[PDB]
Design a protein around this nucleic acid. Sequence first.
RNA 1: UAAGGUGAUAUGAACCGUUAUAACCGGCGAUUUCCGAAUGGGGAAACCCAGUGUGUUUCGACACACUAUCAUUAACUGAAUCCAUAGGUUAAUGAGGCGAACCGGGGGAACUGAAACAUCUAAGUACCCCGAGGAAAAGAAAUCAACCGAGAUUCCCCCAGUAGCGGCGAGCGAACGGGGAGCAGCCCAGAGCCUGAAUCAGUGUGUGUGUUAGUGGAAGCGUCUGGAAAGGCGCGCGAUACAGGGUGACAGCCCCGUACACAAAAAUGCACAUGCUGUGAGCUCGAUGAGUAGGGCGGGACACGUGGUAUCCUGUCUGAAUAUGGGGGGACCAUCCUCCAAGGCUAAAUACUCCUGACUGACCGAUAGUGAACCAGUACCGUGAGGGAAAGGCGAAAAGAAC
RNA 2: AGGACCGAACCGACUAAUGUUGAAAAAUUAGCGGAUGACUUGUGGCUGGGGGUGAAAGGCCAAUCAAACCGGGAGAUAGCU
RNA 3: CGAAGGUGUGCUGUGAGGCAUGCUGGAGGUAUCAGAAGUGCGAAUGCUGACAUAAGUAACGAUAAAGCGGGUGAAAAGCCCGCUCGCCGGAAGACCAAGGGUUCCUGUCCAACGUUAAUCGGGGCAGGGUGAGUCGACCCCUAAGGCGAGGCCGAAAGGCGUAGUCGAUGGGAAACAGGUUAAUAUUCCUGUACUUGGUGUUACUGCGAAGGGGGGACGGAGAAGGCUAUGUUGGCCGGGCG
RNA 4: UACGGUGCUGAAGCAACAAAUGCCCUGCUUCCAGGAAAAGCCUCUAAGCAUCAGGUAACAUCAAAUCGUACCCCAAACCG
Lengths: 102, 37, 46, 77, 63, 93
Amino acid sequence: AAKIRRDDEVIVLTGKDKGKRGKVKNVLSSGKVIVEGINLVKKHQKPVPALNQPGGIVEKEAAIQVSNVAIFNAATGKADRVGFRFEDGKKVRFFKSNSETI
Amino acid sequence: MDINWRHNQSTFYHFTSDHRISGWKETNAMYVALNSQ
Amino acid sequence: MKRTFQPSVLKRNRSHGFRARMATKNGRQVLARRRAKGRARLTVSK
Amino acid sequence: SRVCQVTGKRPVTGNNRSHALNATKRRFLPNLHSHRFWVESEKRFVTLRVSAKGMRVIDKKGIDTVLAELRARGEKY
Amino acid sequence: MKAKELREKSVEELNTELLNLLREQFNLRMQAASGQLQQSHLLKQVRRDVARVKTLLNEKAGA
Amino acid sequence: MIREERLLKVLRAPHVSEKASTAMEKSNTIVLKVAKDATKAEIKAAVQKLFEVEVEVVNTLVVKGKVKRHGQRIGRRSDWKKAYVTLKEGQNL
RNA sequence: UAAGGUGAUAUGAACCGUUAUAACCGGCGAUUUCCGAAUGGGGAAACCCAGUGUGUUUCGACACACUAUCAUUAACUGAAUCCAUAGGUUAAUGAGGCGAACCGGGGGAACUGAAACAUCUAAGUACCCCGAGGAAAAGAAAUCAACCGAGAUUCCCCCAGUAGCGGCGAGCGAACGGGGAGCAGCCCAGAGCCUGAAUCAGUGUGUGUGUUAGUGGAAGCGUCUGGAAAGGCGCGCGAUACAGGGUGACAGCCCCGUACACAAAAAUGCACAUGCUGUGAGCUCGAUGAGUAGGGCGGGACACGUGGUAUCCUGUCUGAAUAUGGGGGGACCAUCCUCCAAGGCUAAAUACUCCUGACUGACCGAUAGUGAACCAGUACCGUGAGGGAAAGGCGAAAAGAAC
RNA sequence: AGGACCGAACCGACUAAUGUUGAAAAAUUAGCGGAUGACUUGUGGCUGGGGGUGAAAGGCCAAUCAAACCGGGAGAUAGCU
RNA sequence: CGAAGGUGUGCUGUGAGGCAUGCUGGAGGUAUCAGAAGUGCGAAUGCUGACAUAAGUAACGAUAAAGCGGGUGAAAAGCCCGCUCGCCGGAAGACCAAGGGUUCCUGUCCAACGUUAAUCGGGGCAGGGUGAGUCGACCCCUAAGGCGAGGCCGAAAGGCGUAGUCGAUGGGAAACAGGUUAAUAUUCCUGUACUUGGUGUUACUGCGAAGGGGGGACGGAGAAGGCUAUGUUGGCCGGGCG
RNA sequence: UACGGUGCUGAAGCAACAAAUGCCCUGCUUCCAGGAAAAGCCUCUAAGCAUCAGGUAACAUCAAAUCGUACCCCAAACCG
């Protein structure tokens, strides 16, 4: 299965946002994730003469790699790796280092 | 253009014509050879 | 001047077409080489 | 084709050799003749393309045994 | 809807067959190609639903 | 008779143009894109039974597909069939 | 298996799904237009035209199925002619076509070399054709050997560039014998005794294992440079896991994995076991392959070019003996030794890679490596067979340039 | 009547000039021959490589012909450059 | 805290070479001592790509020929409109077959294509456009010829060929006038028609073939005669009196 | 009258002569060099069917499917 997944809160390990926490917006099958407020790029797009014309410099979030984030433990308050155990026929994720099921 | 240039360089590679030099170039080489004999 | 290729579809097909390659041993070997070389059009049909 | 229907004699290949030993290809042909054989057990004439030693082996084995061999190997007479 | 179609009779899958083609399929091709039909996914789901009815109808009839 | 399963697959779209428009508003004919293997008896029966109108006669041409290109990649479109369906004096659609 | 999906260029729109009937992966099914062996007739492939039968509560039109040829078998018919054969009709079974190499067989060059060329060579090669299998072929001594013995076939290393063959030129080139790989023997020509006795073949079932989806899978932080850290420095931990790949520079400990340990509802390959069917064990006695062996003529294969040439094959003409017999032992005769032709089957060692998986390289890195890293046998050229390209790399991320 | 006469279409190609890296891998312009015949032309068919066809020139057989084109033997061979 | 590579400088060895370093570059390089070579290019009328040279030179493709006004446009010798002028008129007009295959028509763009410019185009992009009982094909029938069940023949592949079956360039049923679209028309519309089959009713009734006969069924040349298409002139009708 | 045209209305609409290489003519005359086939078409019957089927005539009704149809076509669209 997948370790970092959709509605999950992560911290960022490498680059430009190192140590910034945030919630995963979505997760792309390239092996990337979009996490809110994190990898902000300053796109500037053209006001297309179709449906509504924003113009300007829109500040979006970019997709960071899945390996550049790890999910935030919040019981220790640090980054933590994820394993998979079976509980009652459910393959659950669990935090390593305190072994807690998420 | 490149394909037409390769094929249109490839035009007189298998020729036969003997009065024309290289298949196409007009000359007087028949009279030159013939007068040399 | 009257060049060599004076086209006719009926002679193109009766001569070099598929039902005429398949009609004999050696044309079937022609089609076998064109398929084996892997060729977008085998005969000249249309 | 020039095959004896009894003995199965094809034409084979060979060489014309000469006095200077020049090898040339040739074919040796069987002595194929089309002869009409009376069978008494069927009261009929079955015509075959035999060699001239298919007739020897018909004279020795008999025509019935030979026809049993041709019917055995699917040679149609 | 796969067990639901599986539990009828041959006559009733011929009825919902002819109603998938009739009511749904044709009116959405005519409605789709005349500028209407905002909802385009209906074309897909109708088409696959006719595939289900013909599948169960072939499985129910004989082998 | 023609089965209704066949008879639904034949008509494909109404054809919108200005020749089509003047055919409707001037000579009762509705122009519509049909199945490529659809005969005139099938188109007549399918407009008789799917728009519940009365058809006088059908005229079918087949339109050849245009060789377009994207970038430097050509491709022929696709042949379709167009039916000029002449209705009777009582019609709407 | 699953929290994300509706293949790519290629974004959108419209939606589906989140604890299970989204999607993705696998087993088995269903559908599978038209052309193509193409098979109902035809044809300029992807089209034209049917016949026959069954059914269609608008049966004035539709739908479905069958209809090719040939071989074999059976049934019913059936001439010249009486019986009968030929023929005809119908049914059942099988075949047909494609495919890269390997294999057996039918045909079979020449350039070249001989410093010319004809015998010879190249070479039974290239090529053409037929056929078959996962291998084929061969194979169970009418074989060698040599007065001792060996014991079917096939493959490898010697023998040995040897003996020989050779316009005795150019060249061709063994066997015996030795060492290994592998090892397996049988059946019919024929009756009685006796039966299902080993034997395999076809199938069911059970077990084991493998394939086709998968599951879990260790262990790290601080600080400095930097756009970014996996790098420097400092201190820790894993290892049956430091194979490899990715991650914003070089990561055992970030991610996917690797070692390791497990997993199959279903379909299967292999190996045992077992049920049924077919098949026949074993004993006594008898038989023990005729236009054949051999011969004459012509040719070919044997390393051996007709030579003193054994042996094998046969196109032609002939032609035995048949266990008190016959073949061979390199002209040939005698003595001695060995073997039993004219019927057939047979695993393994062996050869090859269209194709699949894993791994590896003192192989190539875009004028190289495939012709082809890129929608390449394409564009293009040629009536046609056929010929046949060029063309990779922004960035870490499009943030790909609002105004 | 005519392998009759003059002469357009039509078939041809005798002379000259131009052209000869052409407008054209054989033409243009001005004259020229045949023009009811052994003529000419359209569409289809047949003949194939030591082979075809030839009112014969070794002509023609897809701008190729004292032996076509394609592929292969094949990296033929080259005492020569 | 900056590799390979690229481009300079300085030092150094007898030489092939080596070493250090500035700038570009942006991620790899490799001592020493061994090992293996697709191991060193100026020549091969070498192969591939690039770029010069002649040189801003010859040429810009029939000596049928243009001139002006106006419009559009950023720009007009070339486009559109108008008036003149010239050229073809047994063609340089019109309609097809073969062949091509969207080039047709409309809107829009001027990068490349157009031997110049281009607003234009057979160019780019998008949309539209081809309507049949009577035209043609398919279809029925056949020629040359192809293929060919059986068959005869042949090492194999295969050759020939009977029945048959295909094969037009030939034989076989039927529509004309007028109007219309930017683009189709003997196809659409208006008017007036015709042909061949199926089925049903009614009246009369001998029907029936891969069989017999007719017919289809067919040469070159020449000669007139009768016509028509078509044209010329007069009449008529409308307009002009310059 | 989006000046591009769009509708409405519309007179005469005859005769003479000339005349084809087109039509009668697949004729006629003539000449040797002696000039396709098969079907549709019309007829005759054989086997068979014979108060049925079929044939003919009139009327009515249904059907006539499929593919081509743009555009160039002595040419800037075909072969060069």
